[PDB]
Design a protein around this ligand. Structure first.
Ligand SMILES: CC(=O)N[C@H]1[C@H](O[C@H]2[C@H](O)[C@@H](O)CN[C@@H]2CO)O[C@H](CO)[C@@H](O[C@@H]2O[C@H](CO)[C@@H](O)[C@H](O)[C@H]2NC(C)=O)[C@@H]1O
Length: 128
């Protein structure tokens, strides 16, 4: 599913991401925008043999199991395909673990390069 911007904001807010680990809702929306363009089905392969999955491009070397990634830790204890669901619950629960692990949202490369330091609140403009 391709979420609308405010639709995703509302889902993320309901799931407790607004200010989770001190990151305002716009940070999370901005991260999803540039990681997946709001597409829950997005997948992308990386050079180390891992793949990124879903709305928040969660990586299979660390967080989920896809059965084909060398050195995979599966720290969210979930199959990577669960992170492609139209329901963002699993991705949110896993993202909460990721952002709590020491480097905050720097875990998301697109967030660091395209969101960090910017007017991220603009990503929730007009949303109710
Ligand atoms: C969301 C996520 O899974 N983040 C990973 C991060 O994934 C990137 C990947 O690096 C890119 O090549 C493609 N897109 C993904 C999402 O933007 O990868 C990081 C390492 O490259 C990883 O950070 C490591 O996390 C573990 C567990 O928290 C730590 O123990 C390490 O210290 C982290 N290593 C570094 C260098 O920060 C993200 O979790």
């Amino acid at each position: 599913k391709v979420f609308g911007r405010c639709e995703l904001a509302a889902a993320m807010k309901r799931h407790g991401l607004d200010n989770y680990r001190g990151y305002s809702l716009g940070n999370w929306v901005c991260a999803a925008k540039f990681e997946s363009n709001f597409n829950t089905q997005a997948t992308n392969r990386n050079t180390d043999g891992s793949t990124d999955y879903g709305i928040l491009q969660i990586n299979s070397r660390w967080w989920c199991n896809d059965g084909r990634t060398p050195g995979s830790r599966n720290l969210c204890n979930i199959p990577c395909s669960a992170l492609l669901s139209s329901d963002i619950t699993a991705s949110v629960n896993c993202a909460k673990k990721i952002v709590s692990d020491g480097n905050g949202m720097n875990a998301w490369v697109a967030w660091r390069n395209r969101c960090k330091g910017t007017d991220v609140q603009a990503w929730i403009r007009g949303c109710r």
